[PDB]
Coordinates of C-alpha atoms and ligand atoms in Angstrom, one line a residue:
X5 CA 103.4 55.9 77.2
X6 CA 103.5 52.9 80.1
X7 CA 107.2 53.2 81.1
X8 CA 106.3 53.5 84.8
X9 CA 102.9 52.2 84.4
X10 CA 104.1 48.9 86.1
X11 CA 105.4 50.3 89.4
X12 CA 102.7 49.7 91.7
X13 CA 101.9 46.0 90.1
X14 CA 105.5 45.0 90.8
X15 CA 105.4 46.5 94.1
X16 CA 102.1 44.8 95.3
X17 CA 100.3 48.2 95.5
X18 CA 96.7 48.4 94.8
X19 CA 94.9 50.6 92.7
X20 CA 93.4 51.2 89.5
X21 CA 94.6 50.6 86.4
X22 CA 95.8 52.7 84.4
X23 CA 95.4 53.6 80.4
X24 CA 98.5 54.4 78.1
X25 CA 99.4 57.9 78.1
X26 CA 96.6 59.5 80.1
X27 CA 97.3 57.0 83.0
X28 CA 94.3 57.4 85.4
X29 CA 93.9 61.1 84.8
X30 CA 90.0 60.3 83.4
X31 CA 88.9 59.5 87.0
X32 CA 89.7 63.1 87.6
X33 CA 86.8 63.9 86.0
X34 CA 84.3 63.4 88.7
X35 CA 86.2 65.5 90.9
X36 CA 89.5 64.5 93.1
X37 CA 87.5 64.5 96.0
X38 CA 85.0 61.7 94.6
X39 CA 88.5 59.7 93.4
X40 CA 90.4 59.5 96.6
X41 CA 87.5 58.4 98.6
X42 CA 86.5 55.9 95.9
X43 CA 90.0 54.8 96.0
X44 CA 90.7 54.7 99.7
X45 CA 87.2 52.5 100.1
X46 CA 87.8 50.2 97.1
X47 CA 91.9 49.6 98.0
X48 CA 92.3 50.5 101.8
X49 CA 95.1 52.3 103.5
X50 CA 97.4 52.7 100.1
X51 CA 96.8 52.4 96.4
X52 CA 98.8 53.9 93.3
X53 CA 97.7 55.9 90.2
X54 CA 99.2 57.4 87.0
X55 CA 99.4 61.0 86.5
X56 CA 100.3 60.3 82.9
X57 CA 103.3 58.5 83.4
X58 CA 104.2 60.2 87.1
X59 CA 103.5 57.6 89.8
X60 CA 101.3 58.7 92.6
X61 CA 101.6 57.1 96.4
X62 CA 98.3 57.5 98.3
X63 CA 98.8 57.0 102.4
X64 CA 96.0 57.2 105.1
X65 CA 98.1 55.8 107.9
X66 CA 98.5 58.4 110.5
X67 CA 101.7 57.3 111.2
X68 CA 103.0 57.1 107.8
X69 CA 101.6 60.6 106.9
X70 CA 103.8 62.2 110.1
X71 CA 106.5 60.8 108.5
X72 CA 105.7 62.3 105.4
X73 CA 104.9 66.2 106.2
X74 CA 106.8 66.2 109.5
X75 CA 109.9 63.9 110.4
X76 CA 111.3 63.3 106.8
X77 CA 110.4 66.4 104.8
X78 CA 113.1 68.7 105.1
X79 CA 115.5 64.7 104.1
X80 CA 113.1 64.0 101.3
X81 CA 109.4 65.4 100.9
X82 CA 110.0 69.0 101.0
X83 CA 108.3 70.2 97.7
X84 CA 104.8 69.9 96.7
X85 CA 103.8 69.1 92.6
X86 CA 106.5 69.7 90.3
X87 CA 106.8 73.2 89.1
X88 CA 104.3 74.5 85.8
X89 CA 105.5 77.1 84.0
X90 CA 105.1 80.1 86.2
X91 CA 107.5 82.8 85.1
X92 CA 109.2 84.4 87.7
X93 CA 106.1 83.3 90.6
X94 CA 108.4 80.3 90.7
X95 CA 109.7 82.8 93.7
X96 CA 106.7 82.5 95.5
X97 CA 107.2 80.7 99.0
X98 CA 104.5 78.4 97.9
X99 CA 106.3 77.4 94.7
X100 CA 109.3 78.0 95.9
X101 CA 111.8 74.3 96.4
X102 CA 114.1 73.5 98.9
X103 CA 117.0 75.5 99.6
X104 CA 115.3 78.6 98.1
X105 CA 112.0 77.8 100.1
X106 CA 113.3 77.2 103.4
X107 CA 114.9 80.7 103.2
X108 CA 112.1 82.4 101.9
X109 CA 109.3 80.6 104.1
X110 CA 112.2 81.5 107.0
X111 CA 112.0 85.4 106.1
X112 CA 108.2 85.8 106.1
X113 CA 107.8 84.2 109.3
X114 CA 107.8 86.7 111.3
X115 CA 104.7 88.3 109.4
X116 CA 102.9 85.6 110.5
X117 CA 102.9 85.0 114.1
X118 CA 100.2 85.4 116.3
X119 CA 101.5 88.3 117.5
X120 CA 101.5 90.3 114.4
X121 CA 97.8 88.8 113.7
X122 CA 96.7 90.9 117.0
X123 CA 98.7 93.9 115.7
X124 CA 96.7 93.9 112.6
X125 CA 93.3 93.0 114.3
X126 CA 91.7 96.6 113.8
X127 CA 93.0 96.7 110.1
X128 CA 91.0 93.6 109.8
X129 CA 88.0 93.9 111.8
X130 CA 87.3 97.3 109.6
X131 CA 86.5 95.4 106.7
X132 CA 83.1 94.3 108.7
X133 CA 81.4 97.6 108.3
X134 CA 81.4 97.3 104.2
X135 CA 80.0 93.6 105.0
X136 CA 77.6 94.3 106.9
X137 CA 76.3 97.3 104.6
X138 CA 76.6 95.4 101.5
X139 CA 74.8 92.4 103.2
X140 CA 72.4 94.8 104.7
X141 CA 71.4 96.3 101.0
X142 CA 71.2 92.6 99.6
X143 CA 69.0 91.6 102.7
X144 CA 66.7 94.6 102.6
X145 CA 65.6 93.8 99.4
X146 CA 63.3 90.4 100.0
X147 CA 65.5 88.2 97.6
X148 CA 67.7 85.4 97.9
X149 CA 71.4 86.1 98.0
X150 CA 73.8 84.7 96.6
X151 CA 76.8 84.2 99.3
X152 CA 79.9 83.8 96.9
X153 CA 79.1 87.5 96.0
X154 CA 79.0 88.9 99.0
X155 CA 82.0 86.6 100.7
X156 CA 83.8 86.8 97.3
X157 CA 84.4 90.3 98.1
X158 CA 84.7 90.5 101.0
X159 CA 87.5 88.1 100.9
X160 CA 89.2 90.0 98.1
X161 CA 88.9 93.2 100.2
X162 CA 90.7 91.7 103.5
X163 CA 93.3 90.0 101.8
X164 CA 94.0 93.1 99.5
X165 CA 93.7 95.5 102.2
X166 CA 96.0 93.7 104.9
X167 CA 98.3 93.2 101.6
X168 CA 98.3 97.0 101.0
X169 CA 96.8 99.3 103.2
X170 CA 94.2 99.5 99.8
X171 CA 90.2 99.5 100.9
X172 CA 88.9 98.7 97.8
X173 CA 85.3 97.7 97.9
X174 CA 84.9 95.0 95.5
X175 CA 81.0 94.5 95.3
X176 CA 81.0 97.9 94.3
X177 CA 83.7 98.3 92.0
X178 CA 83.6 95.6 89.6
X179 CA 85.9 97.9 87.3
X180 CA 88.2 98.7 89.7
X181 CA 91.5 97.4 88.2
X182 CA 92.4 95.2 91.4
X183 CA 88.6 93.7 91.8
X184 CA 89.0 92.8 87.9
X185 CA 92.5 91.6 88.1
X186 CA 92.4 89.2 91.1
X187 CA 88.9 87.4 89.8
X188 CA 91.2 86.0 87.0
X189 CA 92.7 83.7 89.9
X190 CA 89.3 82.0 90.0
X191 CA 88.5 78.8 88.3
X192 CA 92.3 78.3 88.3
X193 CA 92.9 76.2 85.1
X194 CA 90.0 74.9 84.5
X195 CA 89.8 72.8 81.8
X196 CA 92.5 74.6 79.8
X197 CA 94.7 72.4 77.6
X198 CA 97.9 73.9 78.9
X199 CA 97.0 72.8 82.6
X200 CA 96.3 69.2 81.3
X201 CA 99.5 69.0 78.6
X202 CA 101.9 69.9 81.7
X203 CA 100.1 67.1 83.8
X204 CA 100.2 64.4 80.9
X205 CA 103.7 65.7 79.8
X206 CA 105.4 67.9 82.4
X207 CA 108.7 67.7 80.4
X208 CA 107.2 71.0 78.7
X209 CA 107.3 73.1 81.1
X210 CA 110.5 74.1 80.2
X211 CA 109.6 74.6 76.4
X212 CA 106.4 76.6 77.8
X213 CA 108.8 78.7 80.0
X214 CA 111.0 79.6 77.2
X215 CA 108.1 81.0 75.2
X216 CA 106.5 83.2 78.1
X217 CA 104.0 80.8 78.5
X218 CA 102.5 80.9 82.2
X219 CA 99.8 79.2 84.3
X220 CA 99.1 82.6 86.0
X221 CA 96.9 85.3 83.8
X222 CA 99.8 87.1 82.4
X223 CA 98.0 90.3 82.8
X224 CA 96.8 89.8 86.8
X225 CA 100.5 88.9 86.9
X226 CA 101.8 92.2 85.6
X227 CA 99.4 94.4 87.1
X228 CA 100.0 93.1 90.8
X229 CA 103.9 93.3 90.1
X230 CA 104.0 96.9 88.6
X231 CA 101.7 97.8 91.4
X232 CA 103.5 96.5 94.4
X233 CA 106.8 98.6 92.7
X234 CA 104.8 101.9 92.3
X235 CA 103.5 101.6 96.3
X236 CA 106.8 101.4 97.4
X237 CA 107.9 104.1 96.6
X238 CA 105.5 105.9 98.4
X249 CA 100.5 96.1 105.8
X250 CA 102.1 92.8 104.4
X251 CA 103.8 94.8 102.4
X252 CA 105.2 96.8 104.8
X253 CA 106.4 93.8 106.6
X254 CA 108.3 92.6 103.7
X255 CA 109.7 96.2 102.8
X256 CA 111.1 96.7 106.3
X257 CA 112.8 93.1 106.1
X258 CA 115.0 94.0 103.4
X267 CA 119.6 86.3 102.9
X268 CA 118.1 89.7 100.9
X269 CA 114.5 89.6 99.5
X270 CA 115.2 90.8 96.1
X271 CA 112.5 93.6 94.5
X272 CA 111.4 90.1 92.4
X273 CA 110.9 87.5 95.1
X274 CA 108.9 90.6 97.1
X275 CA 106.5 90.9 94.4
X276 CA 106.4 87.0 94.1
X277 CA 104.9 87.2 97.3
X278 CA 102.2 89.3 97.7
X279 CA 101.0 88.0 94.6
X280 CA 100.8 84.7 96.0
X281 CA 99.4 85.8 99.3
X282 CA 96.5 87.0 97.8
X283 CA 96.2 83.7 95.5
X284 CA 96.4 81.6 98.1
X285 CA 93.6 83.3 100.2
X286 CA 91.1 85.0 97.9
X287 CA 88.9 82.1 97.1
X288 CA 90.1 79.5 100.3
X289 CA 88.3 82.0 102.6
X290 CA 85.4 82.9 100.4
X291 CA 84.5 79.5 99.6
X292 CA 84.6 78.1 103.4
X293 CA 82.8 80.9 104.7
X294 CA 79.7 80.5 102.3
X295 CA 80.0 76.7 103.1
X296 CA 79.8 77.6 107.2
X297 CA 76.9 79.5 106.1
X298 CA 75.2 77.0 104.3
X299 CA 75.5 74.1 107.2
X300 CA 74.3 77.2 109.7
X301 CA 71.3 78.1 107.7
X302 CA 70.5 74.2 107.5
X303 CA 71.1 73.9 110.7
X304 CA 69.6 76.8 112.5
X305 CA 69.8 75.0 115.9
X306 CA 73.2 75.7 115.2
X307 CA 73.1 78.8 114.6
X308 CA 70.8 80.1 116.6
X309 CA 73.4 78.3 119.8
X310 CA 76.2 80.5 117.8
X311 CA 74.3 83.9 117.5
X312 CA 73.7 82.8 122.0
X313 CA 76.9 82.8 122.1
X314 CA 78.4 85.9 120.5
X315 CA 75.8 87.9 121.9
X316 CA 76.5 86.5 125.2
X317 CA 80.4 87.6 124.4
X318 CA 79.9 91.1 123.0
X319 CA 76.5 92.3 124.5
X320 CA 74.8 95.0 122.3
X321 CA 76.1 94.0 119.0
X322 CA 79.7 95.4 120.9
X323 CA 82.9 95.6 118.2
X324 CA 84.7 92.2 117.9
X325 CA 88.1 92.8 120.1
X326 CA 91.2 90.3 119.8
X327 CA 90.3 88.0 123.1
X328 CA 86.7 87.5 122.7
X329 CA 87.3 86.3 119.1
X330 CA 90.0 83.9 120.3
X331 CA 87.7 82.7 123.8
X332 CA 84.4 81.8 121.6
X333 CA 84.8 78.3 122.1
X334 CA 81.1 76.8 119.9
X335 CA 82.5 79.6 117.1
X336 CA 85.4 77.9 116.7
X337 CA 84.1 74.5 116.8
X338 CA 81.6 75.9 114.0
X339 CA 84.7 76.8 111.9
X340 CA 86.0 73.5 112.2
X341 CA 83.2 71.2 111.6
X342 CA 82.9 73.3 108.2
X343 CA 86.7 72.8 107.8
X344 CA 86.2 69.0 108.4
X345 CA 83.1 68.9 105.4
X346 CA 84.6 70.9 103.1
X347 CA 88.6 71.2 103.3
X348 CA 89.0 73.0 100.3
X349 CA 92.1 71.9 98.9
X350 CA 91.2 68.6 99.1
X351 CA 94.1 67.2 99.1
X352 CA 98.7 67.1 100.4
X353 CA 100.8 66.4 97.7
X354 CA 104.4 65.8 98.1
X355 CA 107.5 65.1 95.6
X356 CA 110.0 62.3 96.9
X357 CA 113.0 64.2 95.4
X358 CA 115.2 61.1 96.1
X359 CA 114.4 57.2 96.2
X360 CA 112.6 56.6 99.4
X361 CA 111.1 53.9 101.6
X362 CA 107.9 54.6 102.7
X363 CA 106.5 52.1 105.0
X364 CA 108.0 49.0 103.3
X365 CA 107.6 50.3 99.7
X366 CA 110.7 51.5 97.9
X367 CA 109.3 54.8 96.0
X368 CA 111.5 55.9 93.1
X369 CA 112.5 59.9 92.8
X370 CA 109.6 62.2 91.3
X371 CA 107.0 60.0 92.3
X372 CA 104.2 62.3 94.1
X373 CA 103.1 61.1 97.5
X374 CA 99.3 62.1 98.3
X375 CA 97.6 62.8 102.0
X376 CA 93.8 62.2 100.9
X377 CA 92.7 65.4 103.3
X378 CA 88.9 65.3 102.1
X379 CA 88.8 60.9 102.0
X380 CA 90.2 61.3 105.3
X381 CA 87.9 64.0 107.2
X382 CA 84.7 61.9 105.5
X383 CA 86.1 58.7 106.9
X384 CA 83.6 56.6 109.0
X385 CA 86.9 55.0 111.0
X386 CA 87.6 58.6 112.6
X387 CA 84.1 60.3 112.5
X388 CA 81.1 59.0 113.6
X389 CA 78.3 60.3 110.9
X390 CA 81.1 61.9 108.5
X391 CA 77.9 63.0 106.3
X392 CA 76.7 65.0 109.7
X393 CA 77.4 68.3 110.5
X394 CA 78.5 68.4 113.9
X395 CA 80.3 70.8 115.4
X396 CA 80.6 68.8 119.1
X397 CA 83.0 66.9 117.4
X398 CA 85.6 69.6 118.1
X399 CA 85.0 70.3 121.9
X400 CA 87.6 70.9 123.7
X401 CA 86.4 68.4 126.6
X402 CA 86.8 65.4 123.9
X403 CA 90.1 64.0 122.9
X404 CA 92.3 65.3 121.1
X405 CA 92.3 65.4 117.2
X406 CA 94.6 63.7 115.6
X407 CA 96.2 66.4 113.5
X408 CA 97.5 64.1 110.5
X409 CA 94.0 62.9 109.7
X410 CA 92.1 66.5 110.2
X411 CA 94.4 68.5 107.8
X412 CA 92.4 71.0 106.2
X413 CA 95.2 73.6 106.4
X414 CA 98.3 70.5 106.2
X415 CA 100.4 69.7 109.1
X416 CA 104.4 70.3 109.1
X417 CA 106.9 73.0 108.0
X418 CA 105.0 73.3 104.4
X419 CA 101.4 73.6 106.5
X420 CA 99.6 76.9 105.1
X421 CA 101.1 80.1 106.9
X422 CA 98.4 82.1 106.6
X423 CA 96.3 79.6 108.4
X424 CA 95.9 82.1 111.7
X425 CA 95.3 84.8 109.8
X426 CA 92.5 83.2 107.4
X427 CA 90.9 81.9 110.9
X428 CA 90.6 85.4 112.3
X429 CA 89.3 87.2 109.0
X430 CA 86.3 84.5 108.7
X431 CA 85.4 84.5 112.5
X432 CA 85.2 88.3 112.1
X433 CA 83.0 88.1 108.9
X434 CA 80.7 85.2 110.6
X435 CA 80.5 87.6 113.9
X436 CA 79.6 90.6 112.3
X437 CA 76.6 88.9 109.8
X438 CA 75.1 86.7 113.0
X439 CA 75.2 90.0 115.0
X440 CA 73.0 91.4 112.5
X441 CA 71.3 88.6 110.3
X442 CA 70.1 84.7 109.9
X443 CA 70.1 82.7 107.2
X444 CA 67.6 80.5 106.1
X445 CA 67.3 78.3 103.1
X446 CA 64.7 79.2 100.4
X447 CA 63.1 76.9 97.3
X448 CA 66.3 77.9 95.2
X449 CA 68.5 76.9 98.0
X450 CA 70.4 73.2 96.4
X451 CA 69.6 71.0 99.6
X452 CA 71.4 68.8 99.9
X453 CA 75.0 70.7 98.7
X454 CA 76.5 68.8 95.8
X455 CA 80.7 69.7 95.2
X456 CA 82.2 70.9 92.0
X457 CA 84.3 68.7 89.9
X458 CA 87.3 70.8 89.1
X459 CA 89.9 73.0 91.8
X460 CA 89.0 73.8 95.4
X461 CA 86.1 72.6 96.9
X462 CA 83.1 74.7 95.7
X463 CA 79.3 73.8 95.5
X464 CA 77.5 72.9 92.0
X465 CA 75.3 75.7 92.3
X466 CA 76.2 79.1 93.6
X467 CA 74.7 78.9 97.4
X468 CA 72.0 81.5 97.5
X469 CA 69.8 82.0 100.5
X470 CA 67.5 84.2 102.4
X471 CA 69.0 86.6 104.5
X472 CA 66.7 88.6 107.5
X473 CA 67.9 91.3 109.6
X474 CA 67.8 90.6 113.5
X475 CA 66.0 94.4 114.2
Ligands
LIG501 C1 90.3 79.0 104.8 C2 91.3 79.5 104.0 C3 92.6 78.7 103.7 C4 92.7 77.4 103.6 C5 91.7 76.3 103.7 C6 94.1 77.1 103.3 C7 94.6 75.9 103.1 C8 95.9 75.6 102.7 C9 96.5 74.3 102.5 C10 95.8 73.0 102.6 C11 97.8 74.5 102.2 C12 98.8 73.4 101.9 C13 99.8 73.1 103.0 C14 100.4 71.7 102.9 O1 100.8 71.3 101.8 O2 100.6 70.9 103.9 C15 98.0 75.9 102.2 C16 99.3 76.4 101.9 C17 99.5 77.8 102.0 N1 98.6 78.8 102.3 FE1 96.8 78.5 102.9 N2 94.8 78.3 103.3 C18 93.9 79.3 103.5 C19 94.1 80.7 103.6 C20 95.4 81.3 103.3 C21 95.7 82.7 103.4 C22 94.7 83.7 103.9 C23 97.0 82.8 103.1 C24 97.9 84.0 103.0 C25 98.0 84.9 104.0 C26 97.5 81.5 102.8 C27 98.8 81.2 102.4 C28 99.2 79.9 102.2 C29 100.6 79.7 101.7 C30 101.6 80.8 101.4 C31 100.8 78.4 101.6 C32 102.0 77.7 101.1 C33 102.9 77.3 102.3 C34 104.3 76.9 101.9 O3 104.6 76.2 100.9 O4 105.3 77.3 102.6 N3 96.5 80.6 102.9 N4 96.9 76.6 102.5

């Protein structure tokens, strides 16, 4: 296994070197996040690695990247990693490849424009009031909390409830069959061997299909399908329902599966991160709480203006966004030979936008390790949106992005109305990052939490 393994060398291109068969998938270990910004300091503005024997391109040129997720990716980068086994979630507009993708990210469109978002603004701000409560009862009792619980569910019951019209109330009803379900999504293939055999050796994801083998938990899988069928009979959902060029009963389902994949633990995790930088930074937040009080006087309801016109909220949100983007990283599949800046990059070969290496970069940020959230005023320049990319940039970018936006300032509104957070002895200070999937801290964050009255 070193077939490919002399690409880069006999292209010039830096990078590590890699091992037979595993390539340099053992630098994974320490956490993608670590490697690309170990890479990008030791080799500069592009180096190559070995996923096995599948060539990797990493590019930090702004330039180069805008030709990769903007002017050239409907011509040549248009799909993300090659396809796992996946069953039929290979429907899923996220999974979903070129032809098939562009018609089914083209149908859910217009589900996601800002002027469906304000539509659904009272279904969503209604999920503040079980916050708030379940926060309340945590904070009443003189103990640290631990955030991912709280924001976990939370996050499951937005995305579930917008998906469904379904107010479940995840912290308390751990056996609820949709609470129990969607926590199988966390910790998404985390040290299985399946996940690592289809990296090393992605010709078996064929074999793996044939034998009803998915990456997904089969059982989340079947539940959420048989689910979305009973319901209509009798939203997201609704959106999709009304729209049936057809979305087929199959692809539907694919979709409001992924939906809630793709946001349960994104939003959860950021918002315990925003609330970890505000209760180390309680200058911060205190400005913030001045702010939203200064907005909505009296603890008043979040409306759909004053979300959108809290300028230092936003700013907040981003300088999170900018420490801790969550997916850490674009990936992109050249699915012909292309040149990419000067370097002739054969078909399969995976082309890589180092998202976190980038936002920690000391050429773009002054004090990358400091949280800042001036950075993000609107009376500096502009950000250049191919180095900040916490939700991607170009037709692939997330879709839900506006949507996962509005659900956390509404969360982070309604808990500063009522409470700050404060770090306590158990509190890990400073934050250390997990090793394996999105961005998540070592230690669950766990803080102490005091009601404003
Ligand atoms: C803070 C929370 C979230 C973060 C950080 C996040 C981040 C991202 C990122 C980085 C991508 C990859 C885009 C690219 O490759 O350029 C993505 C894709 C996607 N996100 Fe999100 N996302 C979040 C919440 C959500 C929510 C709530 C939804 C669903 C409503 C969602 C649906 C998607 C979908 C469907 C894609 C695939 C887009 C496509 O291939 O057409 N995300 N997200």
């Amino acid at each position: 296994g070193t077939r490919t393994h002399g690409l880069f060398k006999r292209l010039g291109i830096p990078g590590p070197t890699p091992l037979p068969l595993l390539g340099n998938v053992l630098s994974y270990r320490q956490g993608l996040w670590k490697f690309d910004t170990e890479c990008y300091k030791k080799y500069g503005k592009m180096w190559g690695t070995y996923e096995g024997q599948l060539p990797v391109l990493a590019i930090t040129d702004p330039d180069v990247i805008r030709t990769v997720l903007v002017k050239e990716c409907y011509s040549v980068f248009t799909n993300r990693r090659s396809l796992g086994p996946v069953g039929f979630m290979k429907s899923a507009i996220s999974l979903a490849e070129d032809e098939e993708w562009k018609r089914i990210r083209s149908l859910l469109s217009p589900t996601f424009t800002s002027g469906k978002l304000k539509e659904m603004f009272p279904i969503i701000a209604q999920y503040g009031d079980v916050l708030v409560r379940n926060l309340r009862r945590e904070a009443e009792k003189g103990k640290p909390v631990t955030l991912k619980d709280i924001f976990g569910a939370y996050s499951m019951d937005v995305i579930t409830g917008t998906s469904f019209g379904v107010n479940i109330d995840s912290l308390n009803n751990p056996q609820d069959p949709f609470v129990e379900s969607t926590k199988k999504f966390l910790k998404f293939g985390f040290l299985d061997p399946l996940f690592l055999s289809i990296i090393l050796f992605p010709f078996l994801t064929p074999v793996f299909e044939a034998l009803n083998v998915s990456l997904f938990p089969k059982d989340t899988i079947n539940f959420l399908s048989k689910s979305v069928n009973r319901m209509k009979k009798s939203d997201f959902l609704q959106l999709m329902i009304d729209s049936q060029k057809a979305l087929s009963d199959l692809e539907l389902a694919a979709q409001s599966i992924i939906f809630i994949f793709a946001g349960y633990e994104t939003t959860s995790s950021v918002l315990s991160f925003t609330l970890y930088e505000l209760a180390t930074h309680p200058d911060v937040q205190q400005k913030l709480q001045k702010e939203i009080d200064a907005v909505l006087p009296n603890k008043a309801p979040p409306t759909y203006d004053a979300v959108v016109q809290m300028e230092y909220l936003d700013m907040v949100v981003n300088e999170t966004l900018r420490l801790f983007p969550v997916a850490i990283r674009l990936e992109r599949t050249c699915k012909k030979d292309v040149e990419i800046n000067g370097v002739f990059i054969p078909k399969g070969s995976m082309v890589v936008i180092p998202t976190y290496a980038l936002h920690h970069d000391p050429k773009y940020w002054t004090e990358p390790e400091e949280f800042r959230p001036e950075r993000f005023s609107k009376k500096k320049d502009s950000i250049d949106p191919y180095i900040y990319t916490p939700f991607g940039t170009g037709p692939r970018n997330c879709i839900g992005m506006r949507f996962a936006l509005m659900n956390m300032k509404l969360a982070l509104i309604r808990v500063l109305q009522n409470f700050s957070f404060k770090p306590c002895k158990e509190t890990q200070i400073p934050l250390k990052l997990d090793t394996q999937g999105l961005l998540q801290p070592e230690k669950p964050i766990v803080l102490k939490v005091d009601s404003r009255d």
